[PDB]
Ligand code: HEM
């Protein structure tokens with residue numbers, strides 16, 4: 001706990017730690033939602049992790065993401081030193097400067113590219129699930145959640161699969177540090193990895209994501225080596241953590257809820273709607289912004305330089321945005337959320353993610369309609385910039401499955 005800053009009133013102190021929340025054993029989403037209780041003010045101050053504002057409601061979260069003149073992306077991570085070292089592109093930039101880099105990035109991970117990758121994404125999901133099918137059991141996190149999205153990203157990026165363990169290790173230290181590496185050391189190690197690759201692909205431009213970024217133009221002039229490295233590193237981090245953990249939360253839930261599996265098996269055309277309601281319920285990111293000057297927000301005085309966590313996971317969990325928010329309803333009429341961010345940095349890989357999510361639900365349920373959490377298992381979650389599942393042992397009777 002860091003010393004309470006002069007300007008912060010004692011009645012807003014809410015000592016939540018984002019890398020280690022108190023009710024974590026009840027589920028990471030439920031751990032974060034303690035912040036939405038009756039007693040908790042809309043905007044609170046935790047002294048954990050150096051000290052920072054935490055907006056707890058969707059209304060505040062959306063307005064701050066919208067207000068980039070006051071809440072800047074220049075230092076978007078907690079703790080402060082991680083935010084200061086953070087220089088990925090385009091996420092550490094604000095409009096207007098941000099915009100040109102974001103268009104290039106959009107060219108490598110957007111909808112047209114999801115369409116190109118459609119066949120491989122389908123093939124790999126079916127392949128991995130067919131492989132697990134006859135066993136009647138799997139360690140979901142290691143056997144599908146990780147390899148499915150990661151191998152598609154390594155494919156798009158034109159990087160060898162043998163590099164996965166190094167790169168996933170560095171990405172996880174940036175989002176759920178175990179103490180071994182600082183954010184800055186992790187980032188520098190990912191940049192170290194990309195340097196030569198960028199240089200090779202500048203000499204011999206190819207079709208992969210690194211070549212396209214490295215030889216790209218940002219509103220008409222050539223991107224530099226440095227800029228390409230800072231965009232590439234963001235891309236790997238984005239491709240190696242979020243979908244990976246998200247699939248685990250979603251399969252854990254389906255494993256615990258036979259009626260929801262029955263609904264998608266009966267009506268597969270509902271999978272896209274279900275994917276969105278799951279994104280709401282099992283939202284997992286929380287990053288933030290830095291105050292560009294003193295500013296009064298929802299009656300609380302913020303000081304220039306104050307950091308504020310704007311938990312994207314919190315907006316669709318807010319009872320004020322959705323009725324019975326902890327309830328999963330695939331027919332939910334207006335599924336409101338900020339899972340893919342909000343404002344000018346809206347996730348560019350959101351189309352790639354929804355395709356991986358919908359393919360996984362449809363192809364798993366097609367071959368392995370019925371499955372459960374391994375007997376006696378207690379699922380453990382983990383919290384941080386991206387929250388996740390430590391492990392997910394699933395079981396099923398092979399006699400109930402089908403090869404397709
Ligand atoms: C369920 C999966 C995903 C979730 C929940 C998610 C969430 C987010 C969020 C909340 C942001 C904004 C952060 C901020 O405002 O500081 C973001 C940005 C971004 N995401 Fe995703 N993401 C997912 C998947 C992906 C994938 C698969 C990629 C592909 C590499 C990716 C690439 C990006 C990029 C490049 C940005 C930066 C946009 C900018 O800064 O303008 N994301 N994502």
Ligand SMILES: CC1(C)[C@@H]2CC[C@@]1(C)C(=O)C2
Nearest residue numbers: 091237238242285287385
């Ligand atoms: C918060 C995020 C998911 C978003 C893309 C990857 C990520 C960890 C960032 O650094 C920006």
Ligand SMILES: [K+]
Nearest residue numbers: 074083084086
């Ligand atoms: K920074």
